Design a protein around this motif. Structure first.
Motif, short mmCIF file in Angstrom:
data_model
loop_
_atom_site.label_atom_id
_atom_site.label_comp_id
_atom_site.label_asym_id
_atom_site.label_seq_id
_atom_site.Cartn_x
_atom_site.Cartn_y
_atom_site.Cartn_z
N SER A 76 0.81 -1.21 0.00
CA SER A 76 0.00 0.00 0.00
C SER A 76 0.84 1.26 0.00
O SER A 76 1.99 1.26 0.45
CB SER A 76 -0.91 -0.01 1.25
OG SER A 76 -0.12 0.03 2.42
N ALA A 77 0.26 2.35 -0.50
CA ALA A 77 0.96 3.64 -0.51
C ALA A 77 -0.07 4.75 -0.40
O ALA A 77 -1.29 4.50 -0.46
CB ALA A 77 1.78 3.81 -1.83
N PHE A 147 6.08 8.38 7.49
CA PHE A 147 4.72 8.15 7.04
C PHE A 147 4.19 9.55 6.80
O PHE A 147 4.15 10.37 7.71
CB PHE A 147 3.89 7.45 8.13
CG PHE A 147 2.50 7.12 7.69
CD1 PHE A 147 2.24 5.93 7.01
CD2 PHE A 147 1.47 8.03 7.91
CE1 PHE A 147 0.93 5.66 6.55
CE2 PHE A 147 0.18 7.76 7.45
CZ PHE A 147 -0.08 6.57 6.78
N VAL A 148 3.80 9.83 5.56
CA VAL A 148 3.33 11.17 5.15
C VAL A 148 1.87 11.36 5.55
O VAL A 148 1.00 10.61 5.13
CB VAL A 148 3.51 11.34 3.62
CG1 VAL A 148 3.13 12.77 3.18
CG2 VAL A 148 4.98 11.06 3.24
N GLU A 168 5.58 6.29 -0.11
CA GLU A 168 5.64 5.20 0.85
C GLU A 168 7.07 4.98 1.32
O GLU A 168 7.98 5.68 0.89
CB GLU A 168 5.15 3.89 0.23
CG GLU A 168 5.64 3.63 -1.18
CD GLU A 168 7.11 3.29 -1.20
OE1 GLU A 168 7.45 2.14 -0.87
OE2 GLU A 168 7.92 4.17 -1.52
N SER A 192 -4.07 3.37 -0.24
CA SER A 192 -4.90 3.19 0.95
C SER A 192 -5.34 4.52 1.57
O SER A 192 -6.23 4.55 2.43
CB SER A 192 -4.14 2.43 2.04
OG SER A 192 -2.93 3.11 2.36
N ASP A 193 -4.71 5.61 1.17
CA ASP A 193 -5.00 6.90 1.76
C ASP A 193 -4.45 8.01 0.86
O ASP A 193 -3.88 7.72 -0.20
CB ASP A 193 -4.36 6.98 3.18
CG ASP A 193 -2.85 6.79 3.15
OD1 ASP A 193 -2.13 7.79 2.96
OD2 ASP A 193 -2.40 5.63 3.32
#
Ligand SMILES: Nc1nc2c(N)ncnc2[nH]1
Ligand SMILES: Nc1nc2c(N)ncnc2[nH]1
Ligand SMILES: Nc1nc2c(N)ncnc2[nH]1
Ligand SMILES: Nc1nc2c(N)ncnc2[nH]1
Lengths: 225, 225
Positions: A76-77, A147-148, A168, A192-193
């Motif tokens: 995920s990213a 984690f941004v 990511e 995912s976001d």
């Protein structure tokens, strides 16, 4: 080719473990490596752990101990680019670090010393997966040991890499390691976001879906390879 | 104990290679590993390359392929703390990242996900080298995938870690990898610059001296171990 498959988190490897034939587990220095085949291909699967260091160690062990011939990195990213929706897939045709500064010696921002600014997923793997390809995009994924979760950080990253599609914590590390160890790599991610102020909340809700979507693309790729 | 010894750059490994008895070279995945003994101790020496990823891969290969029992990391760093002169040695009793932000999930700034905020050089190694110990200091070395060359960056780092003594690009990565692979590590550095606006200039002038000074401390430690 014996293919090493790396995911940072368990949620990102679970679906692939479920599709592993003649599955065996081998514990190496405290981590579990799954061996077997996926649709005929000899694979080794591993949940590396999060970040640059954990990624790099899995690549090194896959290379040196398991003697793999190629690598695929899935997971995920966070989506940062125009047109990229949560749930979409990004195939990384370029990878770079957004948190590296060795500019004092003349390197471009993001370029690690004694390394190229951009790494790339293997061109033949990219050509093949495009053919087998879910809404998806082809472009740059920027990596950092962070984690941004904020528009300020997103904008910072874009000021260095305007074409960045997603962010990511492992892609460019895996590609740096793979290149150093002379192995082709393919980097795939599902969103995912949005890497914004709510990023941790949506990551928690959608990590399983994103992990599965990226894995499904990887499986489609292996079926055609 | 068979001891793996890692340095990021050739200048930082040269003096040790000169003191290696029954020296042999073994090329593994494009990098050279030197084997032999130093004052009776079985060692493997390697110039890892710069940064988190290259460091982590050397630790993994030393662990998995060479089956080392312990690690010593040596080289140069930038002096940032009061009382630390260029040419001084710092023994890292703690290590942490200054460029890691996973605070969105509650981690402390600098703390990588699923990792402690601080790693440490092995306490028994630290006790022994202190006894064998050149002006020197004992404290925190902060690691980042960046060459620090400006007071603005120094002050940024100190705002997170006020007790930081020196900065460099591999220490905490080596310690993170060593801890994950269940190996004790000792991190030693000699100061080549002040990590200020002129840092690259003084690094170029003093890298050989700093590499040698750190190596001399490592040798004194092995003579007593
Ligand atoms: N400095 C630098 N710029 C570039 C670029 N635009 N493309 C590939 N490699 C690079 N290296
Ligand atoms: N799934 C995922 N989202 C993110 C994000 N916003 N930042 C870093 N890594 C990530 N990984
Ligand atoms: N959050 C956090 N603070 C600390 C500390 N002061 N010392 C050791 N580990 C820590 N972890
Ligand atoms: N010798 C050395 N100086 C430095 C510095 N100023 N920043 C990062 N790594 C380093 N390594």
């Amino acid at each position: 080719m014996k293919i090493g498959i790396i995911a940072a988190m368990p949620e990102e490897l679970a679906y692939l473990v479920q599709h592993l034939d003649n599955a065996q587990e081998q514990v190496v220095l405290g981590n579990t490596y799954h061996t077997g085949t996926i649709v005929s291909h000899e694979v080794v699967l591993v949940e590396s752990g999060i970040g640059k260091v954990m990624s790099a160690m899995s690549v090194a062990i896959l290379a040196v101990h398991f003697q793999v011939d190629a690598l695929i990195n899935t997971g995920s990213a966070g989506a940062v680019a125009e047109g990229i929706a949560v749930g979409d897939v990004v195939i990384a045709d370029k990878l770079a670090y957004h948190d590296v500064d060795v500019t004092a010696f003349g390197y471009a921002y993001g370029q690690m010393a004694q390394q190229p600014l951009y790494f790339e997923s293997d061109k033949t793997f990219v050509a093949q997966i495009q053919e087998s390809l879910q809404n998806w995009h082809l472009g740059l994924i920027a990596t950092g040991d962070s984690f941004v979760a904020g528009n300020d950080k997103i904008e910072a990253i874009k000021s260095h890499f305007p074409e960045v599609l997603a962010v990511e914590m492992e892609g460019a590390a895996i590609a740096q390691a793979a290149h150093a160890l002379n192995l082709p790599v393919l980097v795939i991610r599902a969103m995912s976001d949005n890497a914004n102020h709510e990023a941790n909340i949506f990551f928690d809700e959608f990590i399983i879906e994103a992990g599965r979507r990226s894995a499904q693309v990887l499986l489609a790729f292996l079926k055609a390879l």
